[PDB]
Amino acid sequence: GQMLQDPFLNALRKEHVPVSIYLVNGIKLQGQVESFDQYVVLLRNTSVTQMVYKHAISTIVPARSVNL
Amino acid sequence: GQMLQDPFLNALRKEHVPVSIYLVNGIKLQGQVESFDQYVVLLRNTSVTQMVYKHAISTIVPARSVNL
Amino acid sequence: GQMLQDPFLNALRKEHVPVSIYLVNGIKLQGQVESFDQYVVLLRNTSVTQMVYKHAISTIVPARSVNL
Amino acid sequence: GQMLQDPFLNALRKEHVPVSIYLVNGIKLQGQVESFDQYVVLLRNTSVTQMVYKHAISTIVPARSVNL
Amino acid sequence: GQMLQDPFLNALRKEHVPVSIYLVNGIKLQGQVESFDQYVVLLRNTSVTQMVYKHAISTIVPARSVNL
Amino acid sequence: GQMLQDPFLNALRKEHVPVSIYLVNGIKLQGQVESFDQYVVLLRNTSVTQMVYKHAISTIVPARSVNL
């Protein structure tokens, strides 16, 4: 397939779907996708928006499946 | 050889073959390949479709060998 | 989205916002973003400015959210 | 030197030489190289052909040295 | 910012500043930067000059801050 | 500096200098550099020539410093 990453991330963003982001260091982040670009995902929780490098993301697990 | 990754992934996709995806952080995911693009594999289980970054995948082990 | 990484880093830089940088090896660095370029972030604490490779950064957590 | 990776992999492939592939996550795979492309090696054992991402391979140790 | 990595490394080199290089595998190297190129840093201690791949470097901590 | 990686590797190769190659997974390999290309180093010991991916190498420590 082609050009699926961004539809996925935009669907999480627009639909405000809670996600679990599992990093290569074993940390698991939880929040909403606020925005993203070529290299980063901005992830918002109750406290803060943090900047996550995609290269460090293993998998993004949403609370529910999204339509792309 | 040349251009084998996508035939493999498409064969898993079309044939609905259960896979084990072993990530660089030691997590092992199980499900079916729903779709994929340059950078990601969308992996479906009973619960959810998650987005897996290829850069974090070490090996994809199918339940049976596939024809490319 | 597009071109968000640098606005984020520049906002941390200009606003002098303390950050926690979580590396792929589990080290957590704390300080202020002094500068950055394509590949590195220069992070200043009480003692020193160190050069952090972006490829080794998992997430940058600011003490407060920033305006991009 | 130049253009050695593929001669090595093709020699393992054509000669059917058993290999140990050591991944960045510490897993050690054993089998024969079935095929390979820019990004992946297809590794066959008694049970299955699995798809191994080169980016996750640290070293490929053959049971015997190969002629390139 | 732009083009900061090399000024940093050259300043360590020219000024002979002792550094701690923290690798993604947790090893910490100590010595002086002898030279560097696109991909590597040559690090000298009492015993030897070793070749360190930048892709494996998380952070370079100097004994004192440098002028770029 | 510029174009140092290959002079280093070729000097180890031509001079037959024993090396320790430290991989990102913590494995330490020992032998002589037999050859190398853009992506791999072929490392020979008493038993075998193995193919090491540069992306998995953290540092190459020679038994003695080499002239580039």
Cα-only R_g, chain D: 11
> A45 with B29: CB under 8 angstroms?
no
Spatial distance between the Cα atoms of D39 and D51, rounded to a whole number of angstroms? 10
Spatial distance between the Cα atoms of F65 and F68, rounded to a whole number of angstroms? 10
SS (H, E, C) F6-60: HHHHHHHHHHCCCEEEEECCCCEEEEEEEEECCCEEEEECCCCEEEEEHHHEEEE
User: Which burial class, exposed, middle or buried, applies to E14 when counting CB atoms under 10 A from its CB (0-12, 13-18, 19+)?
Assistant: exposed
Nearest CB neighbour to B25, from listed A55, A58, A63: A58
User: Which burial class, exposed, middle or buried, applies to D67 when counting CB atoms under 10 A from its CB (0-12, 13-18, 19+)?
Assistant: exposed
Q: What three-state secondary structure class fits A46?
A: coil
Residues belonging to chain F with any Cβ–Cβ distance to chain D shorter than 8 Å: 23-27, 29, 35-40, 42-44, 48-53, 55-56
User: Cα separations (Å) of F68 from E31, E42, F7?
Assistant: 19, 11, 5
Please tell me which chains touch C, using 3 or more CB pairs under 8 Å as the contact test: A, E
> A57 with A22: CB under 8 angstroms?
yes
User: Which burial class, exposed, middle or buried, applies to F21 when counting CB atoms under 10 A from its CB (0-12, 13-18, 19+)?
Assistant: buried
Nearest CB neighbour to F48, from listed D4, D25, D61: D61
Spatial distance between the Cα atoms of F40 and C50, rounded to a whole number of angstroms? 30
> A21 with A60: CB under 8 angstroms?
yes
Residues with Cβ within 8 Å of E47's Cβ and at least 6 positions away in sequence, in order, are none
> C11 with C27: CB under 8 angstroms?
no
Please tell me which chains touch E, using 3 or more CB pairs under 8 Å as the contact test: C, F
Spatial distance between the Cα atoms of B3 and E18, rounded to a whole number of angstroms? 47
| H/E stretch holding D59 | strand D57-62
Amino acid A52 reads V
Spatial distance between the Cα atoms of B47 and E60, rounded to a whole number of angstroms? 43
Residues with Cβ within 8 Å of C30's Cβ and at least 6 positions away in sequence, in order, are C18, C19, C20, C21, C45
For chain B, the domains span: 1-68
Which tokens is A54 given?
């995609």
Spatial distance between the Cα atoms of B65 and D51, rounded to a whole number of angstroms? 10
Binning chain A into helix, strand and coil, the percentages to the nearest 5 are 20, 45, 35
Which tokens is D54 given?
């080169």
Residue of E30, E55, E32 whose CA lies nearest to E42 = E32
* CB pair distance less than 8 Å for B42 and A3: no
Residues of A in contact with B44 (CB under 8 A): 65
This entry's atomic model was obtained through X-ray
Which tokens is E2 given?
């732009």
Amino acid A54 reads K
Spatial distance between the Cα atoms of B37 and B44, rounded to a whole number of angstroms? 15
Which tokens is E31 given?
């010595």
Amino acid B7 reads P
| H/E stretch holding E30 | strand E28-36
Which tokens is A14 given?
């627009």
> A35 with C7: CB under 8 angstroms?
no
